[PDB]
Design an enzyme around this catalytic site. Structure first.
Site, PDB file in Angstrom:
ATOM      1  N   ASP A 111     -16.424   0.024  21.611  1.00  0.00           N
ATOM      2  CA  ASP A 111     -15.611  -1.412  22.458  1.00  0.00           C
ATOM      3  C   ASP A 111     -15.135  -2.638  21.505  1.00  0.00           C
ATOM      4  O   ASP A 111     -16.270  -3.529  20.379  1.00  0.00           O
ATOM      5  CB  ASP A 111     -17.318  -1.867  23.069  1.00  0.00           C
ATOM      6  CG  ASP A 111     -17.184  -2.915  24.147  1.00  0.00           C
ATOM      7  OD1 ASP A 111     -17.700  -3.660  24.887  1.00  0.00           O
ATOM      8  OD2 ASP A 111     -15.442  -3.331  23.761  1.00  0.00           O
ATOM      9  N   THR A 112     -13.588  -2.794  21.142  1.00  0.00           N
ATOM     10  CA  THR A 112     -13.309  -4.042  20.253  1.00  0.00           C
ATOM     11  C   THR A 112     -13.613  -5.195  20.878  1.00  0.00           C
ATOM     12  O   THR A 112     -13.099  -6.193  20.880  1.00  0.00           O
ATOM     13  CB  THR A 112     -11.860  -3.734  20.233  1.00  0.00           C
ATOM     14  OG1 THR A 112     -11.354  -2.920  22.209  1.00  0.00           O
ATOM     15  CG2 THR A 112     -11.431  -2.404  19.505  1.00  0.00           C
ATOM     16  N   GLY A 113     -14.074  -5.447  22.433  1.00  0.00           N
ATOM     17  CA  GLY A 113     -14.000  -6.172  22.877  1.00  0.00           C
ATOM     18  C   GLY A 113     -16.006  -6.857  22.498  1.00  0.00           C
ATOM     19  O   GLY A 113     -15.703  -7.683  23.397  1.00  0.00           O
TER      20      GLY A 113
HETATM   21  C1  LIG Z   1     -21.317  -8.292  22.715  1.00  0.00           C
HETATM   22  C2  LIG Z   1     -21.272  -7.849  24.337  1.00  0.00           C
HETATM   23  C3  LIG Z   1     -21.791  -6.650  24.265  1.00  0.00           C
HETATM   24  C4  LIG Z   1     -22.519  -8.981  25.107  1.00  0.00           C
HETATM   25  O1  LIG Z   1     -20.103  -8.287  25.076  1.00  0.00           O
HETATM   26  C5  LIG Z   1     -19.014  -7.866  26.529  1.00  0.00           C
HETATM   27  O2  LIG Z   1     -19.605  -8.042  26.957  1.00  0.00           O
HETATM   28  N1  LIG Z   1     -17.300  -7.323  26.248  1.00  0.00           N
HETATM   29  C6  LIG Z   1     -17.174  -6.934  27.294  1.00  0.00           C
HETATM   30  C7  LIG Z   1     -15.607  -8.280  27.408  1.00  0.00           C
HETATM   31  C8  LIG Z   1     -15.847  -9.884  27.086  1.00  0.00           C
HETATM   32  C9  LIG Z   1     -15.822 -10.090  26.023  1.00  0.00           C
HETATM   33  C10 LIG Z   1     -16.110 -12.066  25.438  1.00  0.00           C
HETATM   34  C11 LIG Z   1     -16.565 -12.540  27.090  1.00  0.00           C
HETATM   35  C12 LIG Z   1     -16.408 -11.802  27.762  1.00  0.00           C
HETATM   36  C13 LIG Z   1     -16.867 -10.145  28.034  1.00  0.00           C
HETATM   37  C14 LIG Z   1     -16.633  -5.593  26.978  1.00  0.00           C
HETATM   38  O3  LIG Z   1     -15.845  -4.881  26.566  1.00  0.00           O
HETATM   39  C15 LIG Z   1     -17.739  -5.638  27.300  1.00  0.00           C
HETATM   40  C16 LIG Z   1     -17.632  -4.072  28.285  1.00  0.00           C
HETATM   41  C17 LIG Z   1     -19.211  -3.325  27.616  1.00  0.00           C
HETATM   42  C18 LIG Z   1     -19.539  -2.130  29.355  1.00  0.00           C
HETATM   43  C19 LIG Z   1     -18.907  -0.767  30.086  1.00  0.00           C
HETATM   44  C20 LIG Z   1     -19.252  -0.206  30.558  1.00  0.00           C
HETATM   45  C21 LIG Z   1     -20.464  -0.457  31.271  1.00  0.00           C
HETATM   46  C22 LIG Z   1     -20.698  -1.987  30.642  1.00  0.00           C
HETATM   47  C23 LIG Z   1     -20.876  -2.587  29.864  1.00  0.00           C
HETATM   48  C24 LIG Z   1     -17.298  -4.264  29.619  1.00  0.00           C
HETATM   49  O4  LIG Z   1     -18.357  -5.435  30.836  1.00  0.00           O
HETATM   50  N2  LIG Z   1     -16.389  -3.534  30.393  1.00  0.00           N
HETATM   51  C25 LIG Z   1     -16.044  -3.932  31.270  1.00  0.00           C
HETATM   52  C26 LIG Z   1     -14.992  -4.631  31.795  1.00  0.00           C
HETATM   53  C27 LIG Z   1     -14.850  -4.659  33.223  1.00  0.00           C
HETATM   54  C28 LIG Z   1     -13.932  -3.784  33.692  1.00  0.00           C
HETATM   55  N3  LIG Z   1     -14.316  -3.663  34.824  1.00  0.00           N
HETATM   56  O5  LIG Z   1     -13.525  -3.677  32.519  1.00  0.00           O
HETATM   57  C29 LIG Z   1     -16.499  -2.071  32.268  1.00  0.00           C
HETATM   58  O6  LIG Z   1     -15.360  -1.047  31.585  1.00  0.00           O
HETATM   59  N4  LIG Z   1     -16.522  -2.234  33.278  1.00  0.00           N
HETATM   60  C30 LIG Z   1     -16.615  -1.114  34.016  1.00  0.00           C
HETATM   61  C31 LIG Z   1     -17.856  -0.655  34.370  1.00  0.00           C
HETATM   62  C32 LIG Z   1     -19.748  -0.984  35.610  1.00  0.00           C
HETATM   63  C33 LIG Z   1     -20.256   0.111  36.162  1.00  0.00           C
HETATM   64  C34 LIG Z   1     -21.514  -1.207  36.246  1.00  0.00           C
HETATM   65  C35 LIG Z   1     -21.656  -1.726  35.668  1.00  0.00           C
HETATM   66  C36 LIG Z   1     -21.270  -2.347  34.262  1.00  0.00           C
HETATM   67  C37 LIG Z   1     -20.294  -1.589  34.154  1.00  0.00           C
HETATM   68  C38 LIG Z   1     -16.517  -1.748  35.912  1.00  0.00           C
HETATM   69  N5  LIG Z   1     -15.598  -1.121  36.536  1.00  0.00           N
HETATM   70  O7  LIG Z   1     -16.716  -2.300  36.713  1.00  0.00           O
END
Ligand SMILES: CC(C)(C)OC(=O)N[C@@H](Cc1ccccc1)C(=O)C[C@@H](Cc1ccccc1)C(=O)N[C@@H](CCC(N)=O)C(=O)N[C@@H](Cc1ccccc1)C(N)=O
Ligand SMILES: [Cl-]
Ligand SMILES: [Cl-]
EC number: 3.4.23.16
Lengths: 99, 99
Positions: free
Chosen positions: B25-27
């Site tokens: 996860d680059t984010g």
């Molecule tokens: C270190 C720490 C983990 C705390 O950092 C982050 O939150 N980074 C953020 C991006 C971000 C960066 C900086 C500030 C805010 C946000 C993202 O890379 C995190 C990732 C990690 C993650 C992936 C899958 C499930 C849960 C979490 C994240 O939130 N991705 C999300 C981004 C929103 C989107 N729709 O793309 C993602 O793919 N969400 C999906 C999957 C999901 C389903 C249910 C519950 C949670 C997630 C979605 N479609 O909702």
């Protein structure tokens, strides 16, 4: 380009005629941008991440230039703390992780 | 390897003697894993993403085998919805984005 990860992988994007900065985020299935207006219609949606969910608006067929690579795809807009370019668009510019 | 982004960039990791799957996860500045016990001491911490904040336990100097590359670093443990390997460790395996 090759982007290392010692710093946040931020890139400049152009969307809806505005210049913005966004994070190349392999952890995001979707592309999520802070509040902004966009040409066209939309459907409401919710998405989640680490701390829960947010309501966003979902716009299809939006043009975005990410480091000068034009792509057309769905962009979500709502109260995200940071602009993130997700896998929906990363695939379209041919972006890979490599180690 | 080179990992495309048409699917989630899931990799197998070995940590605390256990096998788990985690998203490259680059984010994510940090590495956050669901509940598990870990050798050693820790300090409490809060982290945010989309949706808000969660409390995690922060453990330093943990060893983790990510796709067979050994790295040692801080691992956060707490209620994340998904295991994520963040930049803190991605740098140590030499991971880059390329397009
Ligand atoms: C270190 C720490 C983990 C705390 O950092 C982050 O939150 N980074 C953020 C991006 C971000 C960066 C900086 C500030 C805010 C946000 C993202 O890379 C995190 C990732 C990690 C993650 C992936 C899958 C499930 C849960 C979490 C994240 O939130 N991705 C999300 C981004 C929103 C989107 N729709 O793309 C993602 O793919 N969400 C999906 C999957 C999901 C389903 C249910 C519950 C949670 C997630 C979605 N479609 O909702
Ligand atoms: Cl798309
Ligand atoms: Cl670390």
């Amino acid at each position: 380009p090759q982007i290392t990860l010692w710093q946040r992988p931020l890139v400049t994007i152009k969307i809806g005629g505005q210049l913005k900065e966004a994070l190349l985020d392999t952890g995001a299935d979707d592309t999520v941008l802070e509040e902004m207006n966009l040409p066209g219609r939309w459907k409401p949606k919710m998405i989640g991440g680490i701390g829960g969910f947010i309501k966003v608006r979902q716009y299809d067929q939006i043009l975005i230039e990410i480091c000068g690579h034009k792509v057309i795809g769905t962009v979500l807009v709502g109260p995200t703390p940071t602009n993130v370019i997700g896998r929906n668009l990363l695939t379209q510019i041919g972006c890979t992780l490599n180690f």
